[PDB]
């Protein structure tokens, strides 16, 4: 329920890299694509251009994949799976899968409380019965 | 159209390759009389490889 | 700028088993420039290149500055026209200081850098011997002139953020 202490999580870039000329056209979706033009201001990386994706922006290995709570995430879609995930696991937390129905989530939460594995989405889909 | 600029940089990229050890000591172009006599001298006592 | 006297000789050879020592009075910014100039002069005047020669010493000379003495410099400037000759006359406390004043006028008046000018001779001239009017005017015992640049005292207006209540008098 409480994560091990760990080290400060530093994110090198706060805002997502966006593809060149994403703002100008709806057809160009924000998904990053490498600058490929012969005379692309982006490929050259001229002053005032959007930043380019580089391995340098990599998060510290120990903090990589870790969620803000301090635990990491391993998804669970059933109760058997949750007992396997928590077995010998004080470094991870379980997000109930979106597919899991409201009826089944009650079983997962009740087992999780016994297991001691934190559930990130414990309040999801809670509306009494049918 | 003709121009040889960048030829020397291209040649020196990993060049200045020496000829090879077999080339320096070879039986090619040598005096045929020298070659015949050399084989007879070799074909006797320790150097002989004949069975 | 610093008054060095350098002693240098041709490298010992089988023809010259004792080569001739040559001394020069090179006024230079630093010992490295002084020894470069010494070799340049020796090459033209005595045919000795640094590659065939050895400088034996380059001693710094310190001169006292107790009183102002007139000094005369004969030099051979080079302008785009070609090499010429020029005599200068500077009243200064020390020879190196006078030579610094000499190089600055030749920079402003004749547009020649340190390496363009070659100093044939420097000397101390007497109050009687002055040959140029500017040195002669101050050489006389009594010299009273109003402050030449009273206005220069605005060096304070720089810091006063320039907001004086009244406009200053000189």
């Amino acid at each position: 329920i409480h994560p091990l202490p760990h080290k400060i999580i530093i994110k090198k870039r706060k805002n997502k890299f966006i593809r060149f000329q994403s703002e100008r056209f709806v057809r160009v979706k924000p998904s990053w694509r490498k600058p490929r033009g012969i005379d692309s201001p982006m490929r050259h990386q001229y002053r005032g251009q959007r930043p380019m994706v580089s391995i340098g922006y990599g998060s510290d290995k120990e903090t990589r994949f870790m969620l803000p709570c301090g635990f990491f995430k391993h998804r669970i879609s059933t109760v058997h799976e949750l007992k396997t995930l928590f077995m010998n696991n004080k470094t991870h937390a379980a997000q109930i899968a979106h597919g899991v129905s409201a009826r089944s989530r009650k079983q997962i939460l009740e087992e999780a409380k016994k297991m001691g594995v934190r559930v990130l989405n414990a309040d999801a889909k809670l509306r009494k019965e049918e | 159209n003709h121009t040889s600029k960048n030829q020397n940089r291209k040649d020196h990229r990993n060049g200045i390759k020496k000829p090879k050890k077999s080339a320096y000591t070879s039986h090619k172009g040598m005096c045929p009389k020298y070659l015949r006599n050399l084989r007879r001298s070799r074909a006797n006592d320790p150097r002989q490889s004949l069975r | 700028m610093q008054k060095y006297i350098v002693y240098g000789r041709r490298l010992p050879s089988e023809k010259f088993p004792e080569p001739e020592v040559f001394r020069m009075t090179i006024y230079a910014p630093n010992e490295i420039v002084a020894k470069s100039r010494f070799w340049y002069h020796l090459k033209s005047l005595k045919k000795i290149k640094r590659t065939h020669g050895e400088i034996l010493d380059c001693q710094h000379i310190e001169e006292n500055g107790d009183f102002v003495k007139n000094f005369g410099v004969l030099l051979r400037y080079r302008s785009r026209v070609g090499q010429h000759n020029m005599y200068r006359e500077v009243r200064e406390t020390t020879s190196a200081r006078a030579m610094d004043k000499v190089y600055s006028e030749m920079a402003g008046q004749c547009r020649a850098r340190y390496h363009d000018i070659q100093i044939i001779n420097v000397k101390e001239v007497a109050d009687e011997d002055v040959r140029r009017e500017k040195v002669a005017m101050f050489t006389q015992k009594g010299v009273r002139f109003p402050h030449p640049c009273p206005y220069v005292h605005v060096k304070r207006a720089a810091r006063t953020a320039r907001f004086q209540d009244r406009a200053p008098h000189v």
Binding site: - | R9, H12 | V21, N30, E31, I32, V33, E54, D57, Y114
Partner: protein, 213 residues
């Protein structure tokens, strides 16, 4: 087994350092005393005592890696200066002196004072061990590599490099080319002779290097 060798070796190196710190200290004093005395004696005899021409130089690269002609690149590589504001110790031989004239535009050099040698080795000095750059923090790691050269301590190192001694080549190669802070540089395109910064600076390389070390 290993514990004994480390306790025994450490004491031997520490003794070498305290014992020879005083020994070299006097030798450096001896050099100033010999030159000062002879200068005065020669003046008494009416002759001028010349001092010996430098056996070692401190060469610092002051220009960059773009636009270097191929000869100039090779000569720099052998001098181990491959980067701007990098400095190496180079012996003075006709071979070294005639090569450095070729590369004068990219370097500034001069005889190094023993305080410059000590402050370069101690603070910015590192070791090439198995082609790695290992920081020199103790006289002990110096001992393992230069053990055949009898140089067993950092002060022993400064003496060999200052004097271009018998164990100089091995010791200069043992020192990873010093990476120094940005050069002051009044002019990069003209020689110190012209008042710029390229080429020989003589004693003034101890002043130029002071800010960079």
């Amino acid at each position: 087994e290993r514990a004994t060798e480390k306790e025994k070796r450490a004491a031997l190196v520490k003794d070498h350092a305290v014992k020879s710190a005083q020994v070299y200290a006097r030798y450096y004093i001896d050099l100033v005393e010999s030159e000062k005395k002879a200068r005065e004696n020669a003046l008494k005899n009416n002759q001028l005592y010349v001092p010996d021409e430098p056996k070692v130089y401190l060469v610092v690269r002051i220009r960059g890696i773009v636009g270097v002609a191929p000869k100039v690149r090779t000569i720099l590589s052998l001098l181990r200066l491959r980067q701007i504001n990098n400095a190496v110790f180079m012996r003075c031989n006709k071979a070294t002196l005639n090569a450095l004239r070729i590369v004068d535009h990219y370097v500034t050099y001069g005889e190094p004072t023993v305080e410059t040698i000590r402050n370069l080795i101690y603070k910015r000095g590192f070791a090439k061990v198995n082609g790695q750059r290992i920081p020199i923090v103790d006289n002990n790691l110096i001992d393992e590599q230069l053990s055949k050269h009898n140089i067993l301590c950092a002060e022993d190192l400064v003496h060999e490099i200052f004097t271009c001694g018998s164990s100089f080549k091995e010791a200069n190669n043992f020192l990873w080319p010093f990476q120094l802070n940005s050069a002051a540089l009044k002019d990069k395109r003209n020689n110190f002779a012209e008042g710029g910064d390229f080429g020989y600076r003589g004693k003034y390389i101890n002043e130029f290097v002071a800010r960079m070390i």
